[PDB]
Amino acid sequence: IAFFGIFIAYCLYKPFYSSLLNLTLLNSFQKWNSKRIHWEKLINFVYNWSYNRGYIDSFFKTSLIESI
Amino acid sequence: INTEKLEDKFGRKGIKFSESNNIPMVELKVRNGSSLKLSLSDAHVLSYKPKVYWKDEGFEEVLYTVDGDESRGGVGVVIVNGSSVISGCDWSVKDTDSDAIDALQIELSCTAGVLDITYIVSLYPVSMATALVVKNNGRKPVTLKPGIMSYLRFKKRSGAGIQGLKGCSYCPNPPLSSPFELLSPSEAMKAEEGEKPGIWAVEDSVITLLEKKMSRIYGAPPAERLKAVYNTPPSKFETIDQGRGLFFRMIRIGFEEMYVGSPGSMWDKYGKQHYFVCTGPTSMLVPVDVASGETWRGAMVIEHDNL
Amino acid sequence: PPAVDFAFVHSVLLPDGTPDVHWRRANGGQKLRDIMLDSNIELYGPYSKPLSNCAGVGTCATCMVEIVNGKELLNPRTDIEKEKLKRKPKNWRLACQTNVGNPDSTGLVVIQQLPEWKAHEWNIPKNI
Amino acid sequence: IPPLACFWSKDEILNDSLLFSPIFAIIACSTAGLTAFYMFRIYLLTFEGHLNTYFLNYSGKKSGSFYSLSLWGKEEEKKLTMNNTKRASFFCNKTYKISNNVRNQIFITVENFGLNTRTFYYPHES
Ligand code: FES
């Protein structure tokens, strides 16, 4: 499962000129996922989570310190 | 030693004129140890080794050529109308004093009657620059088709991709008849999965495999006739190696469409090592017709972004 | 058909010294971010990595594009272009927060993609 | 990674986890997979690939700095500054039925220069 995380990060970020993977599979990664419609909500939710800090920062700065 | 005459007339600090086996030749060396083997009187480049790694052996050979045959290997520029215009080997330098040690330039010059083809090969620390410029003199509008065909050797045959011609339509179109070919246009379109005439297909992949014979010209010059937005194809792509971790990029200036040529499995019949690709921009599917006297500028730049 | 004439001038120059314009085609207005994603032009620059964008919602100023002569057929700022980018030359908009409008549209808006990492100033005509 | 890194700690974590309660265990292994995911994401965004800042597709000052002279030498200009609105690309292209081609908008994309702070020293070792 750790090397699965390695592989999922590797196919997304390691560029084509230096990756060790076969270029048929590397082409098929974007060929299977050139839509960005079922990715356009997932990437949105994960980035908004990591950017708004799970909204817990905003909730603490809204109803805990501004409440005080 | 005519190259000695060019050395004590136009030779400079990074410019070394060489004459062995009665072939005039120049080697351009900018400050970071970037080697550029330009065969003089031919407008044909043999070797090109810019500093990719950060060793003393950072220089890496980019263009494909065999050891002996200088006419079979490397990027050579070609001009047709529809016969070969610049086949005369009357190329001579015009000026060399460009910059001291950081950037260099060898511009050649010939004359094909009405066409004054002067021709710039420049060496920047990150880029080869190949620049064609013709100039009409007679009272005839010539309908010429320029061509700059490069042969980029790849260390591993599995590692071949261009990374960025997605979206624009392509057409399998056989290349120009060069005197400096590696594969003829008869065998470049033989035994593929694109058909021989100019069939049209939209590229729906951000990087293309160059494993098969399927060779094409990217862009829509039939759309160019409308002179709307007409979906001008991108002037850049990241050609990759993937055998070792480096890449290169080709930038056209003045041209419209960009050809790639994939040897497929037919690289075994000429060479034995370092699978190549016949890549370059032309004005072929719609030619250029300048004037009864004007000049046309078309440049091509192969650059690396590793250093 | 109603075809808006985007130009999409690239950020870097050509090494010759002239800008390179790409003249994209796509129909009408839904989002400028979706047009620049679909028609294969370089929007984000270095943020084009998969988790390097908010996938269109506007919570990051990563799709910013300088737009010139873009007062004709454009939506106003949705208080996110007004907030994500604040002290700017005021011709800069987020592609995932702007929209060039309705499908029945003709116009010659010209957009300089990546106003960050550029060297040209465009010499804008002074309005009013 | 077992041989040349630290794995036996997390091995003992999940070994003490799965014989405890089934709710807490497979989600702990799932977060371990996520941990490997983002840590390798961090490593790839930092060290693997081109620089994303001196990259000639991206930085315009970089393209202005590498090319101290143009591609033609003594042609096309004595150098050109104040590159105008070249929408037609000096091709004298005529217009069909469209909204507008030219107007009272005369804006020249005046780019920056070359041969000034040209070095841009690459990140050397501390
Ligand atoms: S993609 Fe997040 S800013 Fe438009």
Curated annotation (Swiss-Prot), chain A:
It is found in: Plastid, Chloroplast thylakoid membrane. The chain crosses the membrane at residues 1-17. NDH shuttles electrons from NAD(P)H:plastoquinone, via FMN and iron-sulfur (Fe-S) centers, to quinones in the photosynthetic chain and possibly in a chloroplast respiratory chain. The immediate electron acceptor for the enzyme in this species is believed to be plastoquinone. Couples the redox reaction to proton translocation, and thus conserves the redox energy in a proton gradient. NDH is composed of at least 16 different subunits, 5 of which are encoded in the nucleus. Belongs to the complex I subunit 5 family. This is NAD(P)H-quinone oxidoreductase subunit 5, chloroplastic. It comes from Arabidopsis thaliana (Mouse-ear cress). The chain holds residues 612 to 679 of 746 of the full protein.
Swiss-Prot record, chain B:
Keywords: Chloroplast, Membrane, Plastid, Thylakoid, Transit peptide, Transport. GO terms for cellular component: chloroplast thylakoid; chloroplast thylakoid membrane; NAD(P)H dehydrogenase complex (plastoquinone). GO terms for molecular function: carbohydrate binding; catalytic activity. It is found in: Plastid, Chloroplast thylakoid membrane. One of its GO terms (biological process) is carbohydrate metabolic process. Disruption phenotype: Malfunction of the NDH complex. H(2)O(2) accumulation in Dark-Light transition. Its main location: plastid. Transmembrane segments: none annotated. NDH shuttles electrons from NAD(P)H:plastoquinone, via FMN and iron-sulfur (Fe-S) centers, to quinones in the photosynthetic chain and possibly in a chloroplast respiratory chain. The immediate electron acceptor for the enzyme in this species is believed to be plastoquinone. Couples the redox reaction to proton translocation, and thus conserves the redox energy in a proton gradient. This is Photosynthetic NDH subunit of subcomplex B 2, chloroplastic. It comes from Arabidopsis thaliana (Mouse-ear cress). The gene is PNSB2.
Curated annotation (Swiss-Prot), chain C:
It comes from the Eukaryota. The keyword DNA repair does not apply. [2Fe-2S] cluster binds at residues 54, 60, 63, 96. GO terms for biological process: P450-containing electron transport chain; photosynthetic electron transport in photosystem I. GO terms for cellular component: chloroplast thylakoid membrane; cytosol; NAD(P)H dehydrogenase complex (plastoquinone). Residues 10-114 form the 2Fe-2S ferredoxin-type domain. It is found in: Plastid, Chloroplast thylakoid membrane. GO terms for molecular function: 2 iron, 2 sulfur cluster binding; metal ion binding. Disruption phenotype: Malfunction of the NDH complex. Keywords: 2Fe-2S, Chloroplast, Iron, Iron-sulfur, Membrane, Metal-binding, Plastid, Thylakoid, Transit peptide, Transport. Part of the chloroplast NDH complex, composed of a mixture of chloroplast and nucleus encoded subunits. Component of the NDH subcomplex B, at least composed of PnsB1, PnsB2, PnsB3, PnsB4 and PnsB5. NDH shuttles electrons from NAD(P)H:plastoquinone, via FMN and iron-sulfur (Fe-S) centers, to quinones in the photosynthetic chain and possibly in a chloroplast respiratory chain. The immediate electron acceptor for the enzyme in this species is believed to be plastoquinone. Couples the redox reaction to proton translocation, and thus conserves the redox energy in a proton gradient. This is Photosynthetic NDH subunit of subcomplex B 3, chloroplastic. The chain holds residues 67 to 194 of 204 of the full protein.
